[PDB]
Amino acid sequence: SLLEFGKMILEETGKLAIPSYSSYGCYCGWGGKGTPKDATDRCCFVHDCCYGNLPDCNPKSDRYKYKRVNGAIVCEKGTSCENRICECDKAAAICFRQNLNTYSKKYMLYPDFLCKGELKC
Numbered sequence: 001s002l003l004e005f006g007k008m009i010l011e012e013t014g015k016l017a018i019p020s021y022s023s024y025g026c027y028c029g030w031g032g033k034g035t036p037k038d039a040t041d042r043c044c045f046v047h048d049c050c051y052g053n054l055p056d057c058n059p060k061s062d063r064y065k066y067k068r069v070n071g072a073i074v075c076e077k078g079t080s081c082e083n084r085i086c087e088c089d090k091a092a093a094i095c096f097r098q099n100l101n102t103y104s105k106k107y108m109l110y111p112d113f114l115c116k117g118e119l120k121c
């Protein structure tokens, strides 16, 4: 769920999910259109695609468990939707940590009309 995703992000990056990553670029948050603006936005695109592979799961509301094994994220065994949702989120949080150095505040509150183009998962 958003509750676990949020905590994972803050743990990884030191930033709070809302509003560092809920209105960034074309894909972090609401958006699902155009070309991702930078590497952080591409993490959100791949995260959305990840969720798109689970049409019968409910990643916003279904809760899973995960633990830290010295830093490393380990998804705990739950239902199969929970395990797969956790893997999507874990990947995104790592993707965000890996691109913290190019995160730009110019992409916060990014306007819709500037999200132009096509990109298939």
Ligand SMILES: CN(C)Cc1c[nH]c2c(CCCO)cccc12
Pocket (backbone or CB within 6 Å): 002, 005, 006, 017, 018, 021, 022, 027, 028, 029, 030, 043, 044, 045, 047, 048, 092
């Ligand atoms: C639901 N609302 C209350 C908050 C919210 C919507 N989308 C979010 C994403 C998606 C970014 C990753 O693709 C990350 C963190 C929080 C949110």
